[PDB]
Design a protein around this ligand. Structure first.
Ligand code: CA
Ligand code: CA
Ligand code: CA
Ligand code: CA
Ligand code: CA
Ligand code: CA
Ligand code: CA
Ligand code: CA
Lengths: 139, 138
C-alpha cells in the first residue's frame, strides 16, 4: 500500500517524510514507491507544490488534501483507469523506447516485478497479463 | 496550540494518539486540552465516533476530516464567537451551578487557570478579564 505523503513508508505522516522529499527535490533519490507517495496533489509529477502542500499539512494549516490516505493503484494499470490493457502496454513501451516518459507517480504501477527499474521484463509481464498467459503480475 | 487528533500534543498524528483516546473512552482521563484535540468531528463531544474517524485516518481509509489541522482557541471565548463577554460568562456560570454543562471541547477555553476543573475560580477570573482588571487570563 502507498500512503500519500508517507515518503519513508513507516505508515505515519511526519516531518521526516517532508525532509526526505525536500532533499529529493535538490538531488533526486526517491524510489518508484516513494515517488507515488510523494505526488500529494495527484497530478502525476513530484515537485515543489507537493512539498508545499505537505508543509502546510504538517504545520496544521492545510486545506483538504489526500495526505494520509492510501493511494489507489493497480499493478500494470499505468494510466490508473482501473483496467490493465494495451493502452498500459503502450505507455510502458514508449517509456522504454525513449518516446515518452512515464509520469513520476505511474512508475510504481508500471514496475511489474518491483525492482525499481522499468525495462523489457516489465513490458513482457504486462503483455503476458493482458493476453491471459499469467494470472497476476509478480509484484 | 490544539491540533485535531494530536492527543499527546507532540505535533504529529500517530498510533499513540489513538491509543490515548481509546484508553480514555474506557476510563476517562484526558485533560481539557486533550479533549479539545480529541473532538475530531468538531461536534463538541468526545466519543467513539471521534475515535472511529481517527482509526480510519490512520489506516489510510478516511474521508475528509479535520485531523491534523490546528483549531484556534481563544481563552474565555466559550461560544467561539470571537469576543469574550457576558455570554461566555453565563455559559461557565451555568456549568458551575449545574444548570448547563459545557461541551467537552469548550472546557479548554473556559479553564482560566489550567487545572482541568471548571469552578468558581474560572468564574472570577473571566469576570476580571471581561472588566479589564486582569490583562490576560493565566
Ligand atoms: Ca512516514
Ligand atoms: Ca504533484
Ligand atoms: Ca489502464
Ligand atoms: Ca521492473
Ligand atoms: Ca501526536
Ligand atoms: Ca466529537
Ligand atoms: Ca464569546
Ligand atoms: Ca479551572
Amino acid at each position: 500500500s502507498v500512503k500519500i505523503g508517507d515518503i519513508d513508508g513507516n505508515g505515519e505522516i511526519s516531518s521526516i517524510d517532508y525532509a526526505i522529499l525536500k532533499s529529493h527535490l535538490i538531488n533526486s533519490n526517491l524510489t518508484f514507491k516513494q515517488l507515488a507517495a510523494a505526488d500529494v496533489d495527484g497530478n502525476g509529477y513530484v515537485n515543489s507544490i507537493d512539498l508545499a502542500i505537505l508543509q502546510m499539512y504538517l504545520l496544521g494549516k492545510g486545506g483538504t488534501s489526500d495526505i494520509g490516505k492510501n493511494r489507489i493503484y493497480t499493478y500494470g494499470d499505468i494510466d490508473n483507469n482501473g483496467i490493465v490493457d494495451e493502452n498500459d502496454y503502450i505507455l510502458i513501451c514508449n517509456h522504454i523506447n525513449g518516446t515518452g516518459q512515464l509520469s513520476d507517480a505511474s512508475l510504481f504501477a508500471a514496475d511489474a516485478d518491483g525492482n525499481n527499474v522499468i525495462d523489457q521484463t516489465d513490458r513482457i509481464l504486462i503483455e503476458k497479463y493482458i493476453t491471459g498467459r499469467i494470472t497476476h503480475l509478480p509484484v
